[PDB]
């Protein structure tokens, strides 16, 4: 019989709360993370709103790695990892030289740093004016190795998964596979991203940036707000968790990966559907057992239409309740599916479904129950967390209730 893998710790840095208590309160309230952009200059974009983390203090969470060794996304990753290990009640004896996997998903990594380097160049008319401190820290592999440095864990496979807007679920899935292989008993997995000019201009140029709020599955939805933060999950063998008397949030049942091999940017209903089916199969779960779906649900025209179709293709005419956590968080990029996964864990543990906020009228092309505008109490036992990205990358995660 295959190894059981449970979630013993959540580290959360988000636009609607820092730490598990505040995040849970956020989710249950339909708190929005939308606020003015402070991180770069929006003059000329015609709008000024994103879902930033408002009051990050790195020096509070990070004690070993010099702050200048990391850009903002790295600092979010390390802080959330420290918070996750503390939420899991892990000690030095539980970590140290213990063999572990650390996998962090990202879309943009330290793109803000890349933009500040380019500013230095342009301002001087000279590439020689660029700061070495910035240039040394721009490579995405650093987002996972710095966690190992902060927690003082040298026996680590530190992989940064760069599958963009699906990366959090890919990393959690890698953690599951790593522990079910028997090669490690503990994995720190999730995603991290930081608000940057690049993402904002990108979505603007594609006409996928809302002029107001994010309204996933709404008939008149107009796209995303850019977001940021980090979610890190402690994945642990059931045997390890029970041996040290850990509190278990939830259990990781399985996941699925699929590639559309179709279009570079457009989502694909057949590809999404395949990912859902492979996940249900890995998890050992029938369709009827799913309490609700955490949709990738970005609030774009193309995403929500196609994702709804895939869900109906899998589940038929009466699918599970399907909600969009990005209604509250905006699109936190690589962190989105990790924060989603943590929302799903908390939904299971605390017995509620988080709402799709900003909802006015469901699209006729999206015939789901989206749990509009307010959270519902419910007997939540098994939950599906969808993610997908450009390059046709799809990753779906199934969580369940432990004992």
């Amino acid at each position: 019989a295959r190894r059981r893998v449970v979630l013993t710790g959540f580290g959360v840095i988000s636009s609607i709360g820092t730490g598990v208590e505040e995040y849970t309160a956020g989710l249950r309230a339909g708190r929005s993370g939308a606020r003015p952009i402070t991180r770069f200059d929006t003059e000329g974009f015609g709008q000024n709103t994103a879902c930033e983390v408002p009051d990050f203090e790195p020096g509070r969470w990070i004690h070993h790695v010099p702050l200048d060794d990391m850009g903002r996304a790295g600092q979010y990753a390390v802080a959330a990892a420290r918070m996750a290990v503390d939420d899991a009640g892990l000690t030095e004896d539980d970590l140290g030289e213990r063999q572990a996997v650390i996998t962090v998903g990202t879309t943009d990594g330290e793109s803000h740093d890349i933009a500040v380097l380019l500013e230095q160049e342009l301002a001087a008319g000279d590439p020689e004016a660029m700061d070495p401190v910035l240039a040394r820290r721009i490579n995405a592999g650093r987002l996972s190795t710095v966690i190992a440095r902060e927690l003082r864990m040298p026996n680590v496979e530190a992989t940064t998964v760069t599958t963009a807007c699906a990366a959090g679920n890919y990393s959690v899935g890698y953690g599951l596979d790593s522990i079910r292989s028997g090669e490690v008993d503990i994995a720190l997995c999730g995603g991290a991203d930081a608000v940057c000019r690049k993402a904002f201009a990108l979505f603007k140029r594609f006409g996928a940036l809302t002029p107001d709020v994010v309204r996933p599955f709404d008939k008149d939805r107009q796209g995303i707000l850019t977001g940021e933060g980090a979610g890190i999950l402690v994945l642990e063998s059931l045997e390890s968790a029970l041996a040290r008397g850990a509190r278990i949030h939830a259990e990781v049942l399985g996941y699925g990966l699929s590639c559309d091999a179709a279009h570079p940017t457009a989502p694909n209903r057949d590809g999404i559907a395949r990912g859902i089916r492979l996940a249900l199969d890995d998890a050992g779960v029938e369709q009827e057992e799913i309490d609700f779906i955490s949709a990738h649900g970005t609030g774009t025209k193309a995403n929500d239409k196609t994702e709804s179709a895939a869900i109906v293709d899998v589940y038929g005419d009466a699918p599970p309740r399907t909600v969009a956590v990005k209604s509250m968080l905006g699109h936190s990029m690589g962190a989105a599916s990790a924060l989603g996964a943590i929302a799903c864990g908390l939904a299971i543990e605390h017995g509620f479904i988080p709402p799709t906020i900003n909802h006015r009228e469901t699209d006729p092309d999206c015939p789901l129950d989206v749990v509009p505008n307010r959270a519902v109490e419910a007997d939540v036992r098994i939950v599906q967390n969808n993610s997908s990205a450009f390059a046709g990358n799809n990753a779906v995660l199934i969580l369940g209730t432990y004992g």
């Binding site: 594609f206 006409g207 457009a266 193309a302």
Partner: protein, 73 residues
């Protein structure tokens, strides 16, 4: 309407790949194609075209209306 049309043709053609006036659509086409053309026009003329006017940018000729409209021509 004048030599603007010739520059518009040239922008379109480079972004969707053809070389004869005329539809969008049944003729290469791809929503990315249409975005590349709206993006090129905007840059050419320092104008802003509302991207909710993409569903009306069909012929080498319906896009002219849009371009000129948004441009105050």
């Amino acid at each position: 309407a004048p030599e603007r049309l010739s520059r518009i043709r040239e922008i379109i053609a480079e972004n969707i790949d053809v070389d004869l006036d005329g539809f969008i659509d049944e003729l290469g086409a791809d929503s990315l194609k249409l975005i590349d053309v709206l993006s090129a026009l905007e840059m050419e003329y320092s104008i802003v075209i509302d991207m909710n006017e993409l569903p009306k940018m069909t012929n080498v000729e319906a896009t002219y209306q849009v371009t000129a409209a948004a441009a105050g021509w």
